[PDB]
């Protein structure tokens, strides 16, 4: 618990803003009509076939009400589909339509490209130092 | 230079932590706002005369979604509109915004407090590094 440097909050926020700006710009130029949260959601559904709406919201630290609307949005765009769960058949399983999987694979490709561009100016040690300091802030909360 | 696999996840984790803390704090102070609202109010305050299209660009969200958010903030008497329409905070908007601002700095202070003064200064340098490549050119 030491005094807080005044430049930190503004500096952190400028990085967050620069990242979403650059990502959005590359997403829009490939005309995917997706935002980072959408890409995030498709990625989680693909990596866990049969993912549950409840588990989706939990993994993302978001109220179910929010997650349901986003899913509703993606379903309305034919990127996501829901099907009654066979097991306890009281839940609903999430799956990517063929279009959703395709758009997810392309969005991810541009994501890793933007990531490389954003952190390239940083040496391997500078990056690891950045990860470590960020990690220490969180671990002490 | 290879890209560290844990860097974006670390940044996203910090983003998530800040968002949930701000939300929680806003709920405790009963300001009836979400983190995105705070962000919107901050951009309008710091860029006087901002129009719907610019706000949309900075939020990285489409005009349709941004239009709805502003209509809600107008109905709540926090924002007012005035070839393009400029956005201004109302007196209530300025005050609510100032509340959010205090909550914002408190959340960031708790996040950074555990770091030593040297770790903080170093964090700032690394963060400055993550910003757009070498620009400056006066000649």
Swiss-Prot record, chain A:
Organism: Pseudomonas aeruginosa (strain ATCC 15692 / DSM 22644 / CIP 104116 / JCM 14847 / LMG 12228 / 1C / PRS 101 / PAO1)
GO cellular component: protein-DNA complex
Record-annotated membrane-spanning stretches: none
Quaternary data: Homodimer.
GO biological process, one term: negative regulation of transmembrane transport
Keyword Transcription regulation on entry: yes
Sorted UniProt keywords: DNA-binding, Repressor, Transcription, Transcription regulation
Ranges in a coiled coil: none
InterPro entries: HTH_MarR-typ, Metal_resp_HTH_trans_reg, WH-like_DNA-bd_sf, WH_DNA-bd_sf
Residue span(s) of domain HTH marR-type: 5-139
Superkingdom of origin organism: Bacteria
GO molecular function: DNA-binding transcription repressor activity; identical protein binding; transcription cis-regulatory region binding
Listed name of the protein: Multidrug resistance operon repressor
Purpose: Repressor of the mexAB-oprM multidrug resistance operon. Also represses its own expression. Many variants lead to increased expression of the mexAB-oprM operon.
């Amino acid at each position: 618990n030491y005094p807080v440097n005044p430049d930190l909050m503004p500096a952190l926020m400028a990085v967050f803003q620069h990242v979403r700006t650059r990502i959005q710009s590359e997403l829009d130029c490939q005309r995917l009509d997706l935002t980072p949260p959408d890409v995030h959601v498709l990625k989680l559904i693909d990596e866990q076939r049969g993912l549950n709406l409840q588990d989706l919201g939990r993994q993302m630290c978001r109220d179910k009400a929010l997650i349901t609307r986003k899913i509703r949005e993606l379903e309305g765009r034919n990127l996501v589909r829901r099907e009654r769960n066979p097991s306890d058949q009281r839940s609903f399983q999430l799956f990517l339509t063929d279009e959703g999987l395709a758009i997810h694979q392309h969005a991810e490709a541009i994501m890793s490209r933007v990531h490389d561009e954003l952190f390239a100016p940083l040496t391997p040690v500078e990056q690891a130092t950045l990860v470590h300091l960020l990690d220490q802030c969180l671990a002490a909360q």
